[PDB]
Amino acid sequence: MTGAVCPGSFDPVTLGHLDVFERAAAQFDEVIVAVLINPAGMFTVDERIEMIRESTADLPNLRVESGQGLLVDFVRERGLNAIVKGLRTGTDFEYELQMAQMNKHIAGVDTFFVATAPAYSFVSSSLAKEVATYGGDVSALLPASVHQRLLGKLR
Amino acid sequence: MTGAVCPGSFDPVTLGHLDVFERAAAQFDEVIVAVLINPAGMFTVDERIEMIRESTADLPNLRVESGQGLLVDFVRERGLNAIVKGLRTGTDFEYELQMAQMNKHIAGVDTFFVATAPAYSFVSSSLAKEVATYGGDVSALLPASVHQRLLGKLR
Amino acid sequence: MTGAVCPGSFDPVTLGHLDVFERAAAQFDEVIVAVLINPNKAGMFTVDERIEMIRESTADLPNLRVESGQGLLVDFVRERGLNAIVKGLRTGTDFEYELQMAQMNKHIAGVDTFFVATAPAYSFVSSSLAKEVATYGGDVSALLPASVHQRLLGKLR
Amino acid sequence: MTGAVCPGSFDPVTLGHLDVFERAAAQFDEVIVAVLINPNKAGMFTVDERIEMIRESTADLPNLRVESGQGLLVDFVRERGLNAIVKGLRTGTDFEYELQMAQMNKHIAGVDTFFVATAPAYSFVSSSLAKEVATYGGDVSALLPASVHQRLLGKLR
Amino acid sequence: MTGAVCPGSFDPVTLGHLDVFERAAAQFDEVIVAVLINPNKAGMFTVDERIEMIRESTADLPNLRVESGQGLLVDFVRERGLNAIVKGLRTGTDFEYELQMAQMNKHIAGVDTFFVATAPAYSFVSSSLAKEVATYGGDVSALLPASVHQRLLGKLR
Amino acid sequence: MTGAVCPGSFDPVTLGHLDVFERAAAQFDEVIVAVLINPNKAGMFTVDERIEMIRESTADLPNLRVESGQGLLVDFVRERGLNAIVKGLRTGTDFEYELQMAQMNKHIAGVDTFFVATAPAYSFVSSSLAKEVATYGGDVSALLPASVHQRLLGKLR
Ligand SMILES: O=C(O)c1cc2cc(F)ccc2[nH]1
Ligand SMILES: O=C(O)c1cc2cc(F)ccc2[nH]1
Ligand SMILES: O=C(O)c1cc2cc(F)ccc2[nH]1
Ligand SMILES: O=C(O)c1cc2cc(F)ccc2[nH]1
Ligand SMILES: O=C(O)c1cc2cc(F)ccc2[nH]1
Ligand SMILES: O=C(O)c1cc2cc(F)ccc2[nH]1
Ligand SMILES: [Mg+2]
Ligand SMILES: [Mg+2]
Ligand SMILES: [Mg+2]
Ligand SMILES: [Mg+2]
Ligand SMILES: [Mg+2]
Ligand SMILES: [Mg+2]
């Protein structure tokens, strides 16, 4: 009965996030995507959850839930003690390293990092929103569903 | 039926390696420690395997095997497609990132990185050997068994 | 024929920026310094002040011109018939964040980015740190062109 | 008579800070801990509370004293007859913004900066992360001096 | 007439190298690929084989030519009337040893270095890792030009 | 009372090293430059040559002395009644490798390590790169003390 939690804001979910979800779902029996409620973003929590659910329909062992507060409490309250996070740079590793060590210290929760697929090395929710705001084409970087929803928030 | 391979030379295995093994064994159903045969080291392959087996007796779902050649072939020939590796720095992440992306490309094998326990952040097989060679006390950094064997190779 | 764009907010321009401008001007037929203006947040200097400070310290570069813009950098570049950006870099961390933006710029518009290592003497000046040091009275006269230093002190007083 | 200044906001002081203070006091005749007063961002503890938490935690360091200050750090250092800063570091990224600042401080005032690696056990603690964890009920008592932990529980009630 | 030199051992040339060559040839009037001859470490391919592999892969770049050389790179560059080097980069660490070399080359000979980010798809390929993977039977054909892959299979037999 | 050890192979000493020596000598009562000799691999310069080059360029530092040693640095430090190492750092990568050794040194012997950022003008000189550039004829006269440069050229000829 293995399992891991994939946390983030996912505003919106990108193909880089989806790649991490698919890799986590292939290596753990149960994956929970943890969508942070952090009350300034573009999509509401419900919209973010729906976009992730739409993009993960081919992953039978993955579910999507929202939460607040300490990630380690979210993880432990579901009987798990592993986090799976995607990583792009060594700079990414250092700040995430501090949080991983803190999370292990306070709750015994482990963090596994997975390297980003090369094709999504430069994709982030924030950069995709910013580029699309000025009319740049990000359709190759986002799930097809997410892309239409993004066009709608801008127009 | 989840599983991961933890590769290295382990010459000798340190408490930093053991920490990674224990974390992998807690999150995957099956863990295989892959001891590289790379024919200049201090211990023979058989001695390295025995030291790891001695230090992992409390991990029922972990076994230790030797191998050569492409790590991805070792992994795939055992029905698995995940590697678990310990990481200390962002510099660690960058060279290991290149190998992880190559391994995914050529064999579909994924790599999960886990941050080192803070207490073992500075321990490496090479630095422990070098310090012990000049008489420094590394007993707090190595499994109790390994420590005696190391004293024997030097004296 | 060849050309590159050197972008930044240049609020104000530093000697590190000027070094980059001079290196780009020596290697490309034309260089455009693109002064980024945020229509929502004013900097310390207005657009005309930023441009004046750059022009005064680049008068010896005949193939360099200065223009302002906003929004997507790759549109500024392509509308001028060019497809190269030149940017200065001080460290490995600068390289990772700038890396993301360079790969996005090539993906969305085919525009290439060339990075050049700062001259050592200017490794540590940034517009933001020069402003913060000067705000609390530190001497930054050797890090800014003559066209900048006293205008900066006047803004602060 | 040698000496160094250890600057920070210390809101609150952590065991990582204390480890740096102890190592500085062991190697310099005089150490001054400089507590930054920022008239903008007012943190969780007042400057007086922060000074008292540091004094309790450093009671066994006779050559270390605690003072508050404002503005340019190198002015604080030189006003006390010193020309050295001692700061703790955790990562290579830490070394990057801090290296820019150290070179700037050497350039503008001739003040030197010595960096020391955090003890491994305290490498993941920071004032900000400790407060955030404690706000949501996590146990950070192994990462803070005993008296800080008591005061921090009070501020959260 | 602008120009730049693209140096390396290219043993063998990869698609990451080729991407850099194409971007340099698009932005400079003349590009010289400089193939290093090292009388000590003799790699897998002779210098002539390496030049021919590059020429096959760059047949559509008319302003790019391939030459071999030895010793100090900045002497090779200045002997050809140029003063710019173009190199591809992958990581922040890459930027570190390469930044030291670029500053040294600027200091000793006035030669500038422009760095370009690898295309994402080729960011994990290197000559050395490709050879190692191919030696043990891994498939690196998507990472090398077609003619390189054929020659590399031959050397392994 | 206070003191620090500045270790290295100094084969040969550079102006970056001398900058570190001067900064340590201004902040500690005594400084010992510890010249590391590998009894198994000779460097370019013998131990007496390395020491002579350092002494000639540190004659204005009355509280600095030069001694050779081998093996564990922490034994050299402790046998002299000291427990501080001072080392220069150029980049974030330098900080990670040196980090490992500083934490091991504190673990096995209680010896602290203080790092100081190189002066910008010497950010890019290393003994190894100066030797390699000089080997192929490049001009490194401005990166080495007078006590070194012509002795280096003589070794190479
Ligand atoms: O990044 C975090 O701190 C975080 C993300 C998150 C998601 C949840 F669903 C609950 C708590 C969280 N904390
Ligand atoms: O690091 C490697 O390349 C490697 C380690 C290893 C261990 C094995 F058992 C087999 C192949 C390997 N390759
Ligand atoms: O950094 C940018 O995104 C940017 C800089 C810039 C300068 C211009 F003139 C126009 C658009 C820009 N965008
Ligand atoms: O980091 C700073 O800018 C800073 C810290 C500090 C502390 C003092 F007590 C006085 C000035 C300061 N400046
Ligand atoms: O990297 C170098 O040192 C180097 C590469 C190279 C290529 C040439 F053709 C000539 C000299 C070189 N030096
Ligand atoms: O870098 C070292 O390990 C080292 C430097 C050194 C210098 C001495 F004089 C003695 C031992 C040393 N060890
Ligand atoms: Mg993102
Ligand atoms: Mg190791
Ligand atoms: Mg700037
Ligand atoms: Mg802190
Ligand atoms: Mg290569
Ligand atoms: Mg050196």
Tab-separated table of N, CA and C in Angstrom, chain F residues 32-144:
chain	number	residue	atom	x	y	z
F	32	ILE	N	49.076	31.934	9.795
F	32	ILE	CA	50.046	30.986	9.253
F	32	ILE	C	49.558	30.538	7.890
F	33	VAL	N	50.389	30.748	6.875
F	33	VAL	CA	50.139	30.205	5.547
F	33	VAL	C	50.676	28.782	5.556
F	34	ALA	N	49.802	27.810	5.324
F	34	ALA	CA	50.165	26.400	5.396
F	34	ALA	C	50.296	25.873	3.970
F	35	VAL	N	51.530	25.605	3.553
F	35	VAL	CA	51.825	25.129	2.208
F	35	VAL	C	51.731	23.610	2.218
F	36	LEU	N	50.687	23.087	1.586
F	36	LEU	CA	50.438	21.654	1.486
F	36	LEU	C	51.354	21.006	0.451
F	37	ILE	N	52.123	20.004	0.876
F	37	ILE	CA	53.001	19.239	-0.006
F	37	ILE	C	52.457	17.818	-0.094
F	38	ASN	N	52.320	17.301	-1.316
F	38	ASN	CA	51.966	15.897	-1.504
F	38	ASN	C	53.250	15.096	-1.618
F	39	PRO	N	53.568	14.216	-0.658
F	39	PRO	CA	54.848	13.499	-0.728
F	39	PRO	C	54.929	12.542	-1.901
F	40	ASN	N	53.828	12.331	-2.622
F	40	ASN	CA	53.790	11.392	-3.732
F	40	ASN	C	53.801	12.046	-5.107
F	41	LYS	N	53.367	13.300	-5.240
F	41	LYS	CA	53.360	13.971	-6.537
F	41	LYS	C	53.957	15.366	-6.404
F	42	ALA	N	55.095	15.581	-7.060
F	42	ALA	CA	55.709	16.898	-7.073
F	42	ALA	C	54.845	17.871	-7.862
F	43	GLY	N	54.769	19.104	-7.383
F	43	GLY	CA	54.140	20.157	-8.150
F	43	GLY	C	55.124	20.751	-9.134
F	44	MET	N	54.769	21.920	-9.655
F	44	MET	CA	55.720	22.630	-10.506
F	44	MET	C	56.896	23.177	-9.710
F	45	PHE	N	56.636	23.679	-8.507
F	45	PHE	CA	57.645	24.308	-7.674
F	45	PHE	C	57.909	23.447	-6.448
F	46	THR	N	59.160	23.412	-6.028
F	46	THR	CA	59.495	22.663	-4.803
F	46	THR	C	58.953	23.426	-3.596
F	47	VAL	N	58.984	22.791	-2.440
F	47	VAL	CA	58.472	23.458	-1.218
F	47	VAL	C	59.273	24.729	-0.927
F	48	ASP	N	60.587	24.712	-1.100
F	48	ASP	CA	61.340	25.934	-0.746
F	48	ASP	C	60.993	27.051	-1.731
F	49	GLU	N	60.777	26.709	-2.991
F	49	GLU	CA	60.405	27.732	-3.969
F	49	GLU	C	59.035	28.326	-3.659
F	50	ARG	N	58.060	27.481	-3.324
F	50	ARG	CA	56.732	27.979	-2.976
F	50	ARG	C	56.797	28.931	-1.793
F	51	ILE	N	57.547	28.545	-0.751
F	51	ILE	CA	57.649	29.367	0.450
F	51	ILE	C	58.351	30.684	0.148
F	52	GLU	N	59.416	30.638	-0.655
F	52	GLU	CA	60.136	31.857	-1.010
F	52	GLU	C	59.240	32.831	-1.768
F	53	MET	N	58.441	32.329	-2.707
F	53	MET	CA	57.557	33.216	-3.456
F	53	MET	C	56.506	33.855	-2.553
F	54	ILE	N	56.008	33.111	-1.560
F	54	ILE	CA	55.034	33.708	-0.645
F	54	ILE	C	55.700	34.738	0.262
F	55	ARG	N	56.871	34.410	0.811
F	55	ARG	CA	57.517	35.348	1.725
F	55	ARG	C	57.855	36.650	1.025
F	56	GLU	N	58.336	36.564	-0.211
F	56	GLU	CA	58.720	37.776	-0.921
F	56	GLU	C	57.530	38.701	-1.168
F	57	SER	N	56.318	38.162	-1.306
F	57	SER	CA	55.171	39.024	-1.563
F	57	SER	C	54.327	39.301	-0.317
F	58	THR	N	54.771	38.868	0.873
F	58	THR	CA	54.081	39.153	2.135
F	58	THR	C	54.980	39.866	3.139
F	59	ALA	N	56.069	40.478	2.675
F	59	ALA	CA	57.022	41.083	3.596
F	59	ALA	C	56.424	42.243	4.381
F	60	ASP	N	55.358	42.865	3.874
F	60	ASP	CA	54.672	43.957	4.558
F	60	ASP	C	53.613	43.478	5.550
F	61	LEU	N	53.539	42.177	5.838
F	61	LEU	CA	52.570	41.628	6.785
F	61	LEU	C	53.323	41.065	7.984
F	62	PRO	N	53.541	41.858	9.033
F	62	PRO	CA	54.424	41.409	10.120
F	62	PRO	C	53.879	40.245	10.925
F	63	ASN	N	52.568	40.003	10.913
F	63	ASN	CA	51.971	38.959	11.734
F	63	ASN	C	51.686	37.688	10.946
F	64	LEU	N	52.270	37.550	9.761
F	64	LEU	CA	52.081	36.379	8.914
F	64	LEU	C	53.381	35.586	8.836
F	65	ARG	N	53.286	34.269	8.978
F	65	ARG	CA	54.423	33.401	8.714
F	65	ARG	C	54.000	32.245	7.825
F	66	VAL	N	54.991	31.583	7.237
F	66	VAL	CA	54.770	30.565	6.211
F	66	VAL	C	55.426	29.266	6.651
F	67	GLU	N	54.669	28.172	6.612
F	67	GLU	CA	55.163	26.853	7.005
F	67	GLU	C	54.562	25.799	6.089
F	68	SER	N	55.326	24.757	5.784
F	68	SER	CA	54.791	23.642	5.016
F	68	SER	C	54.297	22.513	5.920
F	69	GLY	N	53.476	21.649	5.332
F	69	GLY	CA	53.019	20.453	6.015
F	69	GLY	C	52.384	19.492	5.034
F	70	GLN	N	51.906	18.376	5.568
F	70	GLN	CA	51.247	17.361	4.758
F	70	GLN	C	50.197	16.661	5.607
F	71	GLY	N	49.339	15.883	4.946
F	71	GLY	CA	48.356	15.112	5.681
F	71	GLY	C	47.134	15.914	6.091
F	72	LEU	N	46.630	15.666	7.299
F	72	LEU	CA	45.388	16.281	7.766
F	72	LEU	C	45.606	17.737	8.167
F	73	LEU	N	44.883	18.643	7.508
F	73	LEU	CA	44.975	20.061	7.842
F	73	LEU	C	44.630	20.315	9.306
F	74	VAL	N	43.587	19.661	9.833
F	74	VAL	CA	43.210	19.974	11.215
F	74	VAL	C	44.322	19.637	12.205
F	75	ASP	N	45.198	18.671	11.894
F	75	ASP	CA	46.339	18.430	12.786
F	75	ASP	C	47.352	19.568	12.731
F	76	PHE	N	47.644	20.073	11.529
F	76	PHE	CA	48.508	21.244	11.404
F	76	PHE	C	47.965	22.413	12.222
F	77	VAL	N	46.653	22.650	12.144
F	77	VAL	CA	46.042	23.774	12.846
F	77	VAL	C	46.147	23.573	14.354
F	78	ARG	N	45.710	22.422	14.837
F	78	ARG	CA	45.658	22.188	16.302
F	78	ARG	C	47.046	22.106	16.934
F	79	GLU	N	48.014	21.548	16.227
F	79	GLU	CA	49.362	21.475	16.785
F	79	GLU	C	49.956	22.854	17.034
F	80	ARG	N	49.397	23.896	16.425
F	80	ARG	CA	49.841	25.259	16.652
F	80	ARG	C	48.943	26.009	17.628
F	81	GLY	N	48.023	25.311	18.288
F	81	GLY	CA	47.178	25.956	19.274
F	81	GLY	C	46.076	26.798	18.690
F	82	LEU	N	45.752	26.558	17.427
F	82	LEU	CA	44.707	27.364	16.761
F	82	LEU	C	43.519	26.473	16.412
F	83	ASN	N	42.411	27.078	16.003
F	83	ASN	CA	41.256	26.259	15.567
F	83	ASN	C	40.428	27.004	14.521
F	84	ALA	N	41.100	27.793	13.695
F	84	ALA	CA	40.416	28.472	12.580
F	84	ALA	C	41.215	28.358	11.280
F	85	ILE	N	40.494	28.056	10.213
F	85	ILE	CA	40.990	28.066	8.842
F	85	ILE	C	40.334	29.238	8.124
F	86	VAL	N	41.098	29.972	7.311
F	86	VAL	CA	40.548	31.009	6.427
F	86	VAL	C	40.879	30.652	4.985
F	87	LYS	N	39.848	30.624	4.150
F	87	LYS	CA	39.974	30.229	2.735
F	87	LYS	C	39.222	31.213	1.840
F	88	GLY	N	39.764	31.469	0.662
F	88	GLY	CA	39.078	32.322	-0.316
F	88	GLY	C	38.090	31.524	-1.135
F	89	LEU	N	37.003	32.150	-1.553
F	89	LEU	CA	35.968	31.469	-2.370
F	89	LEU	C	35.620	32.363	-3.532
F	90	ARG	N	35.461	31.776	-4.705
F	90	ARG	CA	35.077	32.577	-5.884
F	90	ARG	C	33.601	32.349	-6.208
F	91	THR	N	33.098	31.122	-6.071
F	91	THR	CA	31.715	30.876	-6.563
F	91	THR	C	30.898	29.979	-5.639
F	92	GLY	N	29.644	29.797	-6.016
F	92	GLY	CA	28.748	28.943	-5.276
F	92	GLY	C	29.146	27.478	-5.303
F	93	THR	N	29.762	27.023	-6.393
F	93	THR	CA	30.221	25.647	-6.502
F	93	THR	C	31.400	25.445	-5.547
F	94	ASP	N	32.301	26.422	-5.510
F	94	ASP	CA	33.438	26.373	-4.559
F	94	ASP	C	32.820	26.184	-3.171
F	95	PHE	N	31.752	26.909	-2.886
F	95	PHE	CA	31.173	26.839	-1.532
F	95	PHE	C	30.690	25.417	-1.186
F	96	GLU	N	30.131	24.649	-2.129
F	96	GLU	CA	29.579	23.286	-1.822
F	96	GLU	C	30.665	22.243	-1.536
F	97	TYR	N	31.715	22.237	-2.323
F	97	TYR	CA	32.787	21.256	-2.091
F	97	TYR	C	33.547	21.617	-0.805
F	98	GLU	N	33.877	22.890	-0.677
F	98	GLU	CA	34.544	23.394	0.517
F	98	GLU	C	33.652	23.253	1.737
F	99	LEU	N	32.336	23.323	1.525
F	99	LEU	CA	31.371	23.115	2.594
F	99	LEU	C	31.542	21.738	3.211
F	100	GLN	N	31.599	20.713	2.361
F	100	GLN	CA	31.763	19.350	2.844
F	100	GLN	C	33.017	19.239	3.709
F	101	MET	N	34.135	19.789	3.225
F	101	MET	CA	35.379	19.668	3.980
F	101	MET	C	35.344	20.481	5.270
F	102	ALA	N	34.671	21.623	5.266
F	102	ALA	CA	34.591	22.432	6.498
F	102	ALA	C	33.748	21.706	7.558
F	103	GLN	N	32.674	21.075	7.137
F	103	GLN	CA	31.856	20.372	8.138
F	103	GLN	C	32.583	19.129	8.638
F	104	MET	N	33.314	18.465	7.766
F	104	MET	CA	34.091	17.299	8.247
F	104	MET	C	35.168	17.776	9.226
F	105	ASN	N	35.832	18.884	8.918
F	105	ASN	CA	36.926	19.386	9.786
F	105	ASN	C	36.393	19.778	11.162
F	106	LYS	N	35.202	20.349	11.201
F	106	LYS	CA	34.607	20.742	12.493
F	106	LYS	C	34.199	19.474	13.250
F	107	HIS	N	33.705	18.480	12.527
F	107	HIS	CA	33.268	17.214	13.161
F	107	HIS	C	34.451	16.474	13.771
F	108	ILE	N	35.555	16.365	13.047
F	108	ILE	CA	36.619	15.500	13.546
F	108	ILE	C	37.557	16.208	14.518
F	109	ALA	N	37.603	17.542	14.508
F	109	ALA	CA	38.604	18.246	15.300
F	109	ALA	C	38.134	19.557	15.904
F	110	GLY	N	36.888	19.970	15.699
F	110	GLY	CA	36.421	21.216	16.273
F	110	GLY	C	36.987	22.458	15.631
F	111	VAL	N	37.591	22.338	14.455
F	111	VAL	CA	38.229	23.467	13.784
F	111	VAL	C	37.198	24.154	12.893
F	112	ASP	N	37.081	25.473	13.032
F	112	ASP	CA	36.135	26.272	12.260
F	112	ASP	C	36.779	26.732	10.963
F	113	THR	N	35.957	26.963	9.946
F	113	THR	CA	36.425	27.508	8.671
F	113	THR	C	35.680	28.792	8.348
F	114	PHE	N	36.431	29.851	8.057
F	114	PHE	CA	35.873	31.125	7.615
F	114	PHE	C	36.221	31.330	6.149
F	115	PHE	N	35.218	31.629	5.334
F	115	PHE	CA	35.422	31.851	3.908
F	115	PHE	C	35.345	33.338	3.599
F	116	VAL	N	36.184	33.782	2.681
F	116	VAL	CA	36.128	35.203	2.262
F	116	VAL	C	36.013	35.263	0.740
F	117	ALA	N	35.143	36.133	0.251
F	117	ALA	CA	34.958	36.308	-1.179
F	117	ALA	C	36.205	36.942	-1.780
F	118	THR	N	36.702	36.326	-2.843
F	118	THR	CA	37.797	36.882	-3.617
F	118	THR	C	37.514	38.331	-4.003
F	119	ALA	N	38.577	39.127	-4.121
F	119	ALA	CA	38.445	40.430	-4.758
F	119	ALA	C	38.028	40.230	-6.211
F	120	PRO	N	37.142	41.072	-6.742
F	120	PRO	CA	36.677	40.879	-8.131
F	120	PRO	C	37.792	40.767	-9.166
F	121	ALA	N	38.834	41.601	-9.073
F	121	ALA	CA	39.893	41.605	-10.076
F	121	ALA	C	40.620	40.267	-10.176
F	122	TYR	N	40.574	39.451	-9.126
F	122	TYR	CA	41.215	38.143	-9.123
F	122	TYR	C	40.210	37.013	-9.140
F	123	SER	N	38.954	37.305	-9.438
F	123	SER	CA	37.939	36.265	-9.402
F	123	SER	C	38.326	35.083	-10.279
F	124	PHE	N	39.082	35.306	-11.351
F	124	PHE	CA	39.248	34.257	-12.345
F	124	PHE	C	40.645	33.648	-12.390
F	125	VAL	N	41.582	34.077	-11.542
F	125	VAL	CA	42.890	33.436	-11.525
F	125	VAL	C	42.852	32.258	-10.559
F	126	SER	N	43.448	31.166	-11.001
F	126	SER	CA	43.775	30.037	-10.154
F	126	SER	C	45.197	29.640	-10.506
F	127	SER	N	45.879	28.983	-9.565
F	127	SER	CA	47.214	28.477	-9.869
F	127	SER	C	47.189	27.608	-11.117
F	128	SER	N	46.197	26.720	-11.215
F	128	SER	CA	46.161	25.769	-12.319
F	128	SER	C	45.893	26.463	-13.652
F	129	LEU	N	44.953	27.413	-13.682
F	129	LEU	CA	44.682	28.081	-14.955
F	129	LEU	C	45.812	29.026	-15.347
F	130	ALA	N	46.457	29.666	-14.371
F	130	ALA	CA	47.612	30.499	-14.695
F	130	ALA	C	48.736	29.661	-15.295
F	131	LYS	N	48.996	28.482	-14.723
F	131	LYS	CA	50.020	27.602	-15.279
F	131	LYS	C	49.657	27.157	-16.690
F	132	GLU	N	48.393	26.777	-16.913
F	132	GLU	CA	47.999	26.293	-18.236
F	132	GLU	C	48.050	27.406	-19.277
F	133	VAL	N	47.605	28.616	-18.920
F	133	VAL	CA	47.682	29.718	-19.873
F	133	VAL	C	49.132	30.051	-20.178
F	134	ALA	N	49.973	30.125	-19.142
F	134	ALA	CA	51.378	30.439	-19.386
F	134	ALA	C	52.061	29.346	-20.193
F	135	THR	N	51.647	28.087	-20.019
F	135	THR	CA	52.279	26.989	-20.755
F	135	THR	C	52.140	27.192	-22.254
F	136	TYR	N	50.997	27.716	-22.684
F	136	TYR	CA	50.738	27.949	-24.096
F	136	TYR	C	50.967	29.398	-24.499
F	137	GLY	N	51.680	30.166	-23.678
F	137	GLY	CA	52.165	31.479	-24.061
F	137	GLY	C	51.313	32.680	-23.686
F	138	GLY	N	50.200	32.497	-22.987
F	138	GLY	CA	49.379	33.640	-22.624
F	138	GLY	C	50.001	34.492	-21.528
F	139	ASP	N	49.617	35.771	-21.506
F	139	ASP	CA	50.200	36.755	-20.591
F	139	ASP	C	49.427	36.783	-19.274
F	140	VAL	N	50.054	36.286	-18.209
F	140	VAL	CA	49.447	36.234	-16.884
F	140	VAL	C	50.193	37.125	-15.885
F	141	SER	N	50.982	38.083	-16.381
F	141	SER	CA	51.827	38.893	-15.506
F	141	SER	C	51.019	39.712	-14.503
F	142	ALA	N	49.782	40.065	-14.831
F	142	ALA	CA	48.991	40.909	-13.947
F	142	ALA	C	48.218	40.119	-12.898
F	143	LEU	N	48.326	38.790	-12.902
F	143	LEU	CA	47.570	37.933	-11.997
F	143	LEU	C	48.429	37.297	-10.921
F	144	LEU	N	49.742	37.428	-11.033
F	144	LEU	CA	50.715	36.826	-10.159
F	144	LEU	C	51.596	37.913	-9.572
